[PDB]
Design a protein around this ligand. Sequence first.
Ligand SMILES: [Mg+2]
Lengths: 340, 338
Amino acid sequence: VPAFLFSGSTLSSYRPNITIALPHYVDLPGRSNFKLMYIMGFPIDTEMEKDSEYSNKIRQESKISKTEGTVSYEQKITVETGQEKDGVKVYRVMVLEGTIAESIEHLDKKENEDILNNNRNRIVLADNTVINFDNISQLKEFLRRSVNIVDHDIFSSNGFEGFNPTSHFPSNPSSDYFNSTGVTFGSGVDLGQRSKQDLLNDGVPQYIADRLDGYYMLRGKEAYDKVRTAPLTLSDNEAHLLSNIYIDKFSHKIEGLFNDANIGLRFSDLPLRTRTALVSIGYQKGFKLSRTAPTVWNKVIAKDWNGLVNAFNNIVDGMSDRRKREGALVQKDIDSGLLK
Amino acid sequence: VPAFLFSGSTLSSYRITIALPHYVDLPGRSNFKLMYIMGFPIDTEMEKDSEYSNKIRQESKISKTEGTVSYEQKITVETGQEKDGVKVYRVMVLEGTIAESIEHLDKKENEDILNNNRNRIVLADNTVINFDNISQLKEFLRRSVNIVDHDIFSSNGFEGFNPTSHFPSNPSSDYFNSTGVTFGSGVDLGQRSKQDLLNDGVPQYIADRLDGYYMLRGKEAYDKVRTAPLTLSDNEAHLLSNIYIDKFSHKIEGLFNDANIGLRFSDLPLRTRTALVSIGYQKGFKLSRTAPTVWNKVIAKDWNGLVNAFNNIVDGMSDRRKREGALVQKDIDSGLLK
Ligand SMILES: [Mg+2]
């Protein structure tokens, strides 16, 4: 061990400088202590307690949960595979300060299977702490969570926005929202104020946008009648694709609101479920939570996560069940140790 | 020559031969001399001075066709003749409540005198409103006695009206679970018991019909309406609706009056009252929280800004919101506000 140390390939934008395979040491610019040893063509990250000329010091373990945590989607990560015992650590660098998406792609190559399956896998974070993973699958699952702004499965579950691939009209003529409601698809994608071009601009595939001809810009009576006489069912694949585009688009509005608040962290530093809770309430009540959910926003900007659970439990807005489910997401992050 | 001058009845909580003219100063007033003839109070006014008649009173600017007097005020209703700085009026109601006046003026024994003279209201502030006819004054009275206009409130443009048990939501929607069995103009029984309705003044016969509808919400209310709907008579449904509309109106009234603006809710014209209650009834009564832009304009008495505030709410209920704005605008146009 470490097994297959020069197998596979390494994703690195940094590629430093008679093709010689003597060991070369370098300090990776933006940081210390990040000494790298290049043997053959490959970067090797080593640590030891004992002070040295060419090894890094022992890195602190991150408090981030390996089973349920995420790293900020706005951060580059370093992925390493290797072995460690008694104050000596030797890791082949597999991804060196690469994006989450690049990493996910890079880690799924058959070339890297041998090395990733027969060594301990870890992520070295930008803050220079490390997350040690039980296995490569766990690491891969951590990255998958991390790259999403919200948890689209919770979002489209029945406890939240639900999911109906058939054109639906979620109001009735006795309802107060009758005239503002339009033809709806998937998880709350309402076409009442949207044209085909709007959807293309938002990156909806043409094959999907074409399908929705006749459902655009219809509201109230016309949307209601249209659904009753000529409905349309998308396939689950297309409806999820269309839903996620709008979920993510909406999420970025909540994100900017959060970020502009300057509370000492960014939206991407919050755990996935809590981001999902905040987006869920926004999607339903309007995104400017400072006005549409003052008691929630208060707890948020205060980073009072227990208080945030209390706030959700405490609003009666005719939608208290959905609010309790949102507070339950935050409470999960609390109980998991992701918040505080 | 007031036809039937000594006919009919006079409503007055204040008060052998009575065939002699007796004169008094109406107690808590000033320039309110009365003359009792044959047992009936006579309000006289003369231009050129006298010491048995009052000085001529100023005409109120309150609109006789669309205006109201505050339902918290007592009024004097007089019917008679006037010309050339000589006014002589038989008092029909002396400082009575609005409701008292409505009832009194609709008695058959007074029909004749009210039909054949000029009818007016002497207000508490001693200003007068002159009416083209008794029917007009009676309608003016009916507007004044109601805190909001129930017909507008219950019209399709506003809260609407459906005497049949209905469930104004569906399982998809946000509010499916908080919605209960509803009757008339938005009376929701989801958090109400038969006793609550009885406490609120609902008659037993109406309350009794609703037994299986109380306290149901969400799925249970939704199913109940589908499986066992009930249609109330229009009269019973209006009775029930009007109790809750009025109860809600008093909540808004209290908030308005607590703001110290300084006029009381009862001093606003009817249609503007209706507008404010209608938005409260639908969005939550705490308007400073549920509709701040509207509330902030109200308490600043910025009536034009009030219309704009209504016109610019985006809450997914734009149509109704603009109709409420339109009520306020009508009051501005009628010269009732500002
Ligand atoms: Mg309502």
